[PDB]
């Protein structure tokens, strides 16, 4: 949910301008070993609560790959590139999971974001720094505490 991102005064905040009615996003995750995920989130607001209807589907992950073998440690910090394509705000990310044995596992992410209301002004090109962390989990990951920090900026030399 890109509502939880620090936007500075000089960049249009599409996500905070999408409420109360809300917005939705669609995402593709293309992993380097052929694993491919698609995901959707419908984001609404009632009172002081955001509501998330999320769907996630993944196919073609190799049996001995880091995903099926659970050999991942964390996502490395990333920078999302935000731009308009065919009337829609789009975010592309070069992502990398850290693996056990200190190797990395590359994933390319594309997200398209759509405000529910008509006329929500699209922002200009910008960058969004991301960092995501599992703060804690039980042995089988049945319970997980998750944290994210995000900051939008204009890149060098204005960041």
């Amino acid at each position: 949910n890109r509502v939880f991102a620090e936007y500075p005064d000089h960049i249009q905040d599409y996500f905070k301008q999408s409420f109360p009615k809300g917005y939705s996003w669609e995402r593709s995750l293309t992993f380097e070993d052929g694993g491919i995920c698609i995901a959707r989130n419908d984001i609404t607001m009632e009172g002081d609560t955001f509501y998330n209807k999320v769907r996630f589907h993944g196919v073609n992950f190799p049996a001995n790959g880091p995903v099926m073998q659970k050999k991942t440690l964390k996502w490395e910090p990333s920078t999302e590139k935000m731009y308009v394509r065919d009337g829609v705000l789009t975010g592309d990310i070069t992502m990398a999971l850290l693996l056990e044995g200190n190797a990395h596992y590359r994933c390319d992410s594309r997200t398209t974001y759509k405000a529910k209301e008509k006329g929500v002004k699209l922002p200009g090109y910008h960058l969004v720094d991301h960092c995501i962390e599992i703060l804690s989990h039980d042995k089988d990951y049945n319970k997980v505490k998750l944290y994210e920090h995000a900051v939008a900026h204009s890149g060098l030399p204005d960041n």
Binding site: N1, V3, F4, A5, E6, Y7, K16, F19, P20, R27, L29, C37, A39, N41, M45, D48, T49, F50, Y51, N52, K53, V54, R55, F56, H57, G58, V59, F61, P66, V67, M68, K70, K71, T72, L73, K74, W75, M95, L97, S109, I132, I134, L135, H137, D140, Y141, N142, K143, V144, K145, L146, Y147, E148, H149, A150, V151, A152
Partner: protein, 60 residues
Amino acid sequence: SAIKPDMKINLRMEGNVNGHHFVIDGDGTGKPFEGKQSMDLEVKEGGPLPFAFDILTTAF
């Protein structure tokens, strides 16, 4: 206007990876203007997941 400095977050994820169906519920809080959020997640169906939980995390 509509968004407060402190917000609550309710979440429901349904999905399927490698043919394995799952449901995950989430409850948390965040500060939209500081760009920070936290969430407690619980696997309702499909536990224990046979895949890395990490692949799901950016989708919460």
